[PDB]
Every structure is written in structure tokens, then in C-alpha cells.
Coordinates of C-alpha atoms in Angstrom, one line a residue:
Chain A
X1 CA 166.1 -73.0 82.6
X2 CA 167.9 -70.0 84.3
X3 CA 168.2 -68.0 87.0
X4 CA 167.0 -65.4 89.6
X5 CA 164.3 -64.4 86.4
X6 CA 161.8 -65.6 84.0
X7 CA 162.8 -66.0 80.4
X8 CA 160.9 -65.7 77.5
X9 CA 160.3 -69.5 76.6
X10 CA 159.5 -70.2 79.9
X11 CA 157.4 -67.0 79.9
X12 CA 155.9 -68.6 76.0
X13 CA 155.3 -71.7 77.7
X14 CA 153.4 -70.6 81.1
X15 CA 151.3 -68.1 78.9
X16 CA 150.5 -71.0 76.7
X17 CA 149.6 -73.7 79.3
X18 CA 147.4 -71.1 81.2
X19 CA 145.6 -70.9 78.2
X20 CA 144.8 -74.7 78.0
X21 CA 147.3 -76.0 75.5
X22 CA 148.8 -79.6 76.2
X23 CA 152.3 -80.0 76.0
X24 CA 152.2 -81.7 72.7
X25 CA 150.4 -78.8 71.4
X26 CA 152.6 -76.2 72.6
X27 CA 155.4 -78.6 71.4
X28 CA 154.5 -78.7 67.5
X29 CA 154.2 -74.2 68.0
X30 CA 157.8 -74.3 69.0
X31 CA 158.7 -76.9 66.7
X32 CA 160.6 -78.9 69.5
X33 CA 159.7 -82.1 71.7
X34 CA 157.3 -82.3 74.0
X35 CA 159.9 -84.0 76.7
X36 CA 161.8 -80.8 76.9
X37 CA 158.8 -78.9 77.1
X38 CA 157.6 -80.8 80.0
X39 CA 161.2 -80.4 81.7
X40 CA 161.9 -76.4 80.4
X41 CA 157.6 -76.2 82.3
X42 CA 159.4 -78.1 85.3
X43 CA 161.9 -75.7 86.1
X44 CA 160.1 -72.4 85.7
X45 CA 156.8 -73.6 88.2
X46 CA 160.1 -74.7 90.1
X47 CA 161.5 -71.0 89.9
X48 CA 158.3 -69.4 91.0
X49 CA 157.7 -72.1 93.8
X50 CA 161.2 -71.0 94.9
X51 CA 161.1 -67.5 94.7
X52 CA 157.5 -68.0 96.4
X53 CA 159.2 -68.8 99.7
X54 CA 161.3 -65.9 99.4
X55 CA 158.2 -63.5 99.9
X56 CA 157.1 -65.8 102.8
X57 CA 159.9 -65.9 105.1
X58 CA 160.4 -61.6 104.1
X59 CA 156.3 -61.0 105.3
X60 CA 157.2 -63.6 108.3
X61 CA 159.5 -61.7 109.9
X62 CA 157.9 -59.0 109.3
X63 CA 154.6 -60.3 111.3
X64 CA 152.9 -58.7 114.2
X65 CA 152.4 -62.6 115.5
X66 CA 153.4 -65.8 114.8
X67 CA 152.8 -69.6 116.1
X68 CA 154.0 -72.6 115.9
X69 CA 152.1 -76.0 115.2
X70 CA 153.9 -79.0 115.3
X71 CA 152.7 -82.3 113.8
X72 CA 150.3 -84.3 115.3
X73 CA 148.5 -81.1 117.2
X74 CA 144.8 -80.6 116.5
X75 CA 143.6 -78.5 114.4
X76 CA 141.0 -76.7 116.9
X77 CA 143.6 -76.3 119.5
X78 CA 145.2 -73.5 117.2
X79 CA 143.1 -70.4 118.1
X80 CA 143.0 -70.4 121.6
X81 CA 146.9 -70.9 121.4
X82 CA 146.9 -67.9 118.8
X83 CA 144.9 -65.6 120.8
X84 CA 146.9 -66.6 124.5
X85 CA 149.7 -64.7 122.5
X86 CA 147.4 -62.1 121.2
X87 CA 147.3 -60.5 125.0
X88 CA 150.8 -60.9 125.8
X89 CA 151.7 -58.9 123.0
X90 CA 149.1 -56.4 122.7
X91 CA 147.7 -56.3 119.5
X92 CA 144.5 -56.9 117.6
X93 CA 143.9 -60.2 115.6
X94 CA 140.9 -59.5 113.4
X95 CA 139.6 -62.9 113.1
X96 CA 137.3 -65.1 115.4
X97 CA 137.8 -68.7 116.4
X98 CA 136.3 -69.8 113.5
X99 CA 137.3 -67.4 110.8
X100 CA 140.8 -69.2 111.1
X101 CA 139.5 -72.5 111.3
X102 CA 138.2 -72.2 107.9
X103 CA 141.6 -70.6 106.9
X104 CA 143.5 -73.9 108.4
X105 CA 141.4 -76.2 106.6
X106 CA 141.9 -74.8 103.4
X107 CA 145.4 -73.7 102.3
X108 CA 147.7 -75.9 105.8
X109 CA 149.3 -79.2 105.5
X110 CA 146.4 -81.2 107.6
X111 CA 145.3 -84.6 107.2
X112 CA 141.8 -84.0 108.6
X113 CA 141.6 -82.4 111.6
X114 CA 146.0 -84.0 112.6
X115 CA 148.3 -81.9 111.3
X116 CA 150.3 -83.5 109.0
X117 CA 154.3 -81.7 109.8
X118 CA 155.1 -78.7 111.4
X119 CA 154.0 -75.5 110.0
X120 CA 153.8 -71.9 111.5
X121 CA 150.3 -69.4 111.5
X122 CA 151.1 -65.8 111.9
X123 CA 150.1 -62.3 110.6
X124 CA 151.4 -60.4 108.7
X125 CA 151.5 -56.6 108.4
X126 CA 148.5 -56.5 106.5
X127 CA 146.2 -58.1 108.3
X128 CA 146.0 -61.2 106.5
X129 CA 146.5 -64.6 107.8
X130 CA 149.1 -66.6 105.5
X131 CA 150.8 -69.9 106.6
X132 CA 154.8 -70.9 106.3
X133 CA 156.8 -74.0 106.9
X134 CA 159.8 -72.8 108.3
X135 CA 160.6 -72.6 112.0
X136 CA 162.7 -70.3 112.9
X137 CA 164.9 -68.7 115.7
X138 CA 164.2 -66.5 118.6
Chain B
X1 CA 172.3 -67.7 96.2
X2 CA 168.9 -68.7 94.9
X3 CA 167.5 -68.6 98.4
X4 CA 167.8 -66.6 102.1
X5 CA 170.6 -67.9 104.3
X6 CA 170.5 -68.3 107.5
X7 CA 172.7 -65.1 108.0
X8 CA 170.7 -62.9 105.7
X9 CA 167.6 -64.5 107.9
X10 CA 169.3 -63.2 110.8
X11 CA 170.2 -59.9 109.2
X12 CA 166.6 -58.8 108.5
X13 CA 165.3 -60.5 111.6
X14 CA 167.5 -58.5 113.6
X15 CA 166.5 -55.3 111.4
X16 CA 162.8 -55.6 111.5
X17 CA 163.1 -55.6 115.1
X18 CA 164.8 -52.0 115.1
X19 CA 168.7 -52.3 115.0
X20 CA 171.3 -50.5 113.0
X21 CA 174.1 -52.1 111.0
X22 CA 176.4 -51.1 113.4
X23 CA 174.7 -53.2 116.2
X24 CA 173.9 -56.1 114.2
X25 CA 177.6 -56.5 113.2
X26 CA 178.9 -57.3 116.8
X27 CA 176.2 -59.8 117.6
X28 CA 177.2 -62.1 114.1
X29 CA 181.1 -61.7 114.8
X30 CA 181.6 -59.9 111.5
X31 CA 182.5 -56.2 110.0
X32 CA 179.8 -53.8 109.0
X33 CA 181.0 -54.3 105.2
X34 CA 179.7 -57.7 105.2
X35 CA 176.8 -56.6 106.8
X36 CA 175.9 -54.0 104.4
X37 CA 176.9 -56.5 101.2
X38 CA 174.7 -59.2 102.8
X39 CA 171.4 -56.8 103.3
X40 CA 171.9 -55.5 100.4
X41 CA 172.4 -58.4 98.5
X42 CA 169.2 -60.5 100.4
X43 CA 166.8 -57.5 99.5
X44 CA 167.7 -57.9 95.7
X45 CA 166.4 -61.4 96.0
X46 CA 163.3 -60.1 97.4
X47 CA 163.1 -57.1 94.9
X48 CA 163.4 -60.2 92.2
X49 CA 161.2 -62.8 93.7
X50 CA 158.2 -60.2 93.8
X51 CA 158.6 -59.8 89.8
X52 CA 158.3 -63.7 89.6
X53 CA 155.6 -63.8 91.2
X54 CA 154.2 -60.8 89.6
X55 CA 154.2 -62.0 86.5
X56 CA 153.0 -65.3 87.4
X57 CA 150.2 -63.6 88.8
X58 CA 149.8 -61.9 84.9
X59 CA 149.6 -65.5 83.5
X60 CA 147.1 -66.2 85.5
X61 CA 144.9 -62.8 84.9
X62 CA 141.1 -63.2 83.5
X63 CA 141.6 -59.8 82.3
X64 CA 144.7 -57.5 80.5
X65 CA 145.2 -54.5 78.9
X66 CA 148.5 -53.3 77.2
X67 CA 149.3 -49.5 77.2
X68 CA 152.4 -47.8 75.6
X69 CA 154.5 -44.8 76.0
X70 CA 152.3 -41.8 75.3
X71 CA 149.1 -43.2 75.1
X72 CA 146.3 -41.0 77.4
X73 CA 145.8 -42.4 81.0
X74 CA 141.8 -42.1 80.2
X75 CA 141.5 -43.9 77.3
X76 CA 142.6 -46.6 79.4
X77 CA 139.4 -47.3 80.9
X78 CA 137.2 -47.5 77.7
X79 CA 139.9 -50.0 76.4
X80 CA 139.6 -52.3 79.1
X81 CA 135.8 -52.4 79.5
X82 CA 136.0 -53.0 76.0
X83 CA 137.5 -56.2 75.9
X84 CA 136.3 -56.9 79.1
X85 CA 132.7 -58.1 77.5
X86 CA 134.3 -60.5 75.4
X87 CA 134.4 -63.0 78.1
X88 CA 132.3 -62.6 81.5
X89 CA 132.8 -59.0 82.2
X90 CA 133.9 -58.8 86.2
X91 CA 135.8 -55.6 86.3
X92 CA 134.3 -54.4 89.7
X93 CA 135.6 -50.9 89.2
X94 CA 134.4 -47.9 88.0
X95 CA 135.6 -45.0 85.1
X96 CA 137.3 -43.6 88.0
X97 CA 138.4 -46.4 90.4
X98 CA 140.7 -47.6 88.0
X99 CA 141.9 -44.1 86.9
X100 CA 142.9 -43.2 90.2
X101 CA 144.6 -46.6 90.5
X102 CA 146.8 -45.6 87.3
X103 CA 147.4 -42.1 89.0
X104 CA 148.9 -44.0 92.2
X105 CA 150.9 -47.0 90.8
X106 CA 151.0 -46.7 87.1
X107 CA 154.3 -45.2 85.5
X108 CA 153.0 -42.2 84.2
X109 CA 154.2 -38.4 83.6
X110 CA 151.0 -36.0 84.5
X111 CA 148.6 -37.4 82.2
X112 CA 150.8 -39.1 80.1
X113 CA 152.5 -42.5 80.5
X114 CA 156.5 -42.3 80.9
X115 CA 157.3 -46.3 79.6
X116 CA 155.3 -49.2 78.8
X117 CA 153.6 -51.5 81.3
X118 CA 150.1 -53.6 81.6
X119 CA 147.3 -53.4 83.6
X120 CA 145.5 -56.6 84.4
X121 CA 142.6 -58.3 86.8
X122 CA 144.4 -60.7 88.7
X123 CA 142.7 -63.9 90.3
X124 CA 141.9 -61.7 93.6
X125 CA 139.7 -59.1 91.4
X126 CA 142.4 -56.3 92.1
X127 CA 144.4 -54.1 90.0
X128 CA 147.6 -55.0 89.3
X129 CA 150.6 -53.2 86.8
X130 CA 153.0 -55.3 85.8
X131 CA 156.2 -53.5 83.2
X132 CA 156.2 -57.0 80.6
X133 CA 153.8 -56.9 77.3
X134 CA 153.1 -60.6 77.1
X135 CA 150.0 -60.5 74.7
X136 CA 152.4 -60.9 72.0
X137 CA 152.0 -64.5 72.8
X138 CA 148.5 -64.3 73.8
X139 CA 148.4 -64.9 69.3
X140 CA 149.8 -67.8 68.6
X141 CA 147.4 -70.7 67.0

């Protein structure tokens, strides 16, 4: 509905949907249709999803590691390729090969244990594993 | 502009890893004023994109409290554990723990608070302030 922030409809309409309204509820409060609702809803979880990328790519370069996965690669093959790195570059991952395993399965794009497209694993400078899609330069 | 380029991508990739504006500017092929507008400009959408997510984060709290300018910093406490009970009371922090969160990142003057802001559980059980005063619509129905 606008731009670069959050305005007070769309900030009336989240509010209202997180509190388990339906659309055509929240459309009689306003006093306007329900199909504008559902498009004005649209584009502020469209704002946020944006300005949710924007956070990932500033804690991805600013990561102590990062790897790549591309599609197709297993799922289990990730940890020894994240920890190859981790000696190279001598710092301390605080996870074993299965604490990230469970990481992987929950919130990456995987279609059971095939990775669906290419993402990227790294950590970032609080010692908390996050996952982007964006592959990057040197 | 409602995303990173590639150049501001390079810019903060280039100062993460330790270089001045004056070395980054040769390597792009550009002056140190565009440099400096282009930093400048690409951490504004990062300073903006955090107070989306903030206050999506808000929307999404089990638990908030609203405090204005010059209301006490320890009355604070009582008020959320207060209205905490209604629902399922999971504040996992003490009288204190949450009194020297305010003291740390709570806009506040001594013991007084300087402007408005709320103080909410988010979906991670961890404080969060957030400068907004959405329960106005939290009274609607």
C-alpha cells in the first residue's frame, strides 16, 4: 500500500488478522470490501517479506562462514562440507553434525533429504545458524 | 530502491571486510561521493527494514505492555505481570530481569521514561521495545 514503512491500515489489518479475524470480519470494522482487504493484507506480508531479505543479506555478509548448497546435493553431505571450511578459516562452529541437521530439515528449501534449489548455510555474528537464498560473489 | 543492489552489496561487502571509502572507490571505478551517498543510502534501508520487522514481531507478541512519557520504570513490572495472568502467564523473567532490560534498551531519563514506547514478549520469549502504541487497535469489536 506504500513504501519503505508500515502504515496504519496495513498496521489495523495485521493486528486484526493476528488476532483471528477473517477478512470479511475485518471488512464490515472498516466498513469497506473484503477484496481490498485481501489485496491492502497482500502487500504489507509482501513489504515485510521484502524488507525480511534485507536483514538477511546485511547478517550474510556479515558471517564468520558461509556455504553453498546447490540443488540436488544431500542433505547429510552439508556438515562435513561446513566443518572442512571451519579449519581453514579458524573459527569455532558451535554445533555438531546433527544439531544442523535438524536445523536443515526444518526452516531450508528440501524436498526430503534432495535439496530442492540452491540455498546458502552460514553463521552469523551471533552464533546462530540462519539460511539465505542468494549466492553471491567472492 | 526497495531493495540492496548489487553495488551497495559490494559496498558493504567490501566494508565488512575492513576497507575505507577511499579504497573501495578505485576498485568500483567511481568517486568517493558516490560511495559515501550509496553506504549511506543502503544502511537507511537496513535501519528501515529492522522496524518492519520489528513491528511485525509486535503483531505477533503473546504479551504487551504500553508505557508513556513519565510513567515510573518500576511500575512497569507489576503492570505486565498483571495482565500477564489473563492468558497463560509465560513471562520467564523476574522483578528485576526485566527492570534491568528497561535500564539497557528502554528510552528512559534516570528513572523516568524520556518518550513513549512498548514493551512486549515476542514469539522467542525475549524482551523486546518497540517506539509504536498499537493497543489502540487491540479494542475494536
Amino acid at each position: 500500500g506504500s513504501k519503505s514503512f508500515l502504515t496504519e491500515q496495513q498496521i489495523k489489518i495485521l493486528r486484526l488478522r493476528a488476532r483471528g479475524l477473517k477478512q470479511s470480519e475485518i471488512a464490515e470494522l472498516l466498513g469497506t470490501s473484503r477484496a481490498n482487504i485481501s489485496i491492502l493484507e497482500r502487500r504489507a506480508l509482501e513489504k515485510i517479506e521484502k524488507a525480511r531479505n534485507i536483514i538477511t543479506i546485511w547478517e550474510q555478509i556479515n558471517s564468520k562462514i558461509s556455504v553453498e548448497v546447490r540443488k540436488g546435493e544431500d542433505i547429510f553431505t552439508v556438515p562435513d562440507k561446513l566443518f572442512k571450511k571451519a579449519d581453514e578459516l579458524q573459527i569455532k562452529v558451535p554445533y555438531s553434525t546433527a544439531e544442523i541437521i535438524a536445523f536443515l530439515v526444518e526452516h531450508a528449501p528440501i524436498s526430503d533429504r534432495i535439496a530442492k534449489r540452491d540455498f546458502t548455510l552460514f553463521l552469523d555474528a551471533r552464533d546462530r545458524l540462519r539460511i539465505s537464498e542468494c549466492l553471491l560473489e567472492e
